[PDB]
Design a protein around this ligand. Sequence first.
Ligand SMILES: Cc1cc(-c2ccncc2NC(=O)c2nc(-c3ccccc3F)ccc2N)cc(N)n1
Length: 274
Amino acid sequence: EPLESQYQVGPLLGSGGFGSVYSGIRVSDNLPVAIKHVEKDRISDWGELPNGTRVPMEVVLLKKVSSGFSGVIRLLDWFERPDSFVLILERPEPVQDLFDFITERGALQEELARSFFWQVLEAVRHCHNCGVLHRDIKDENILIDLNRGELKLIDFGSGALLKDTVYTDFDGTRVYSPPEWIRYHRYHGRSAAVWSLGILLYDMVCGDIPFEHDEEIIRGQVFFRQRVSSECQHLIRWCLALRPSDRPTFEEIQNHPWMQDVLLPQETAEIHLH
Ligand SMILES: Cc1cc(-c2ccncc2NC(=O)c2nc(-c3ccccc3F)ccc2N)cc(N)n1
């Protein structure tokens, strides 16, 4: 029943605005886990559990996206402490986040970026199907299960329940945020997610994000610093349309000619990760 007996705490993996994440092991079966701590006073968004229990939004959202689908990090357990919440999450091993992967490899070959981008799209569609909006899709929030070539979305701490009305709050990453958020402090869920996906795909094929300042985001002029195919540039420019309604739907992205003939995750690990 207690936290200390159920899990063996390992080293600190990282910390930041999201809280503190440790490597861990579930004592019973030696299953690798990640133990995330978040202070109650530092919590950006609070959520309501069906039984009335007040919990961080991440607990609500991760419970909604809980199935056999490997594209989203699994919430294994959670605990309330007097001044904090502790979340026990899945930990693939060996693992590397996409930001570190891109830093080490530079710009990704298009075949690899296609496989990775396709899995991110499948994971985001699963969230939206479950009524969950991530709101912080970026290289740092994507983990690569290096042996299986499977990607997982992490950090639902800036997320929200998906709705069809305007969002006026935002606590994700500014450089992945759309021009309507920068200009008006307003955005709709799906079209803002598609913009962050265009930032992510550019990041994968160029090895860096396209915009650093508010003025560049608002202007939305995309410059390619690396050699990128015409079909890939077209998809990126489409996701990054200034008008939210001009951005593609997830169906239009996955039917795009650049997205055809994706590798399977295991083929991806064999060709590119081994
Ligand atoms: C260590 C860190 C934390 C976050 C993270 C942020 C917010 N909320 C949760 C986070 N992490 C997780 O949930 C989480 N992290 C890892 C992990 C991440 C990077 C390197 C090695 C790892 F084992 C594995 C399983 C997880 N379930 C993000 C990044 N890039 N790095």
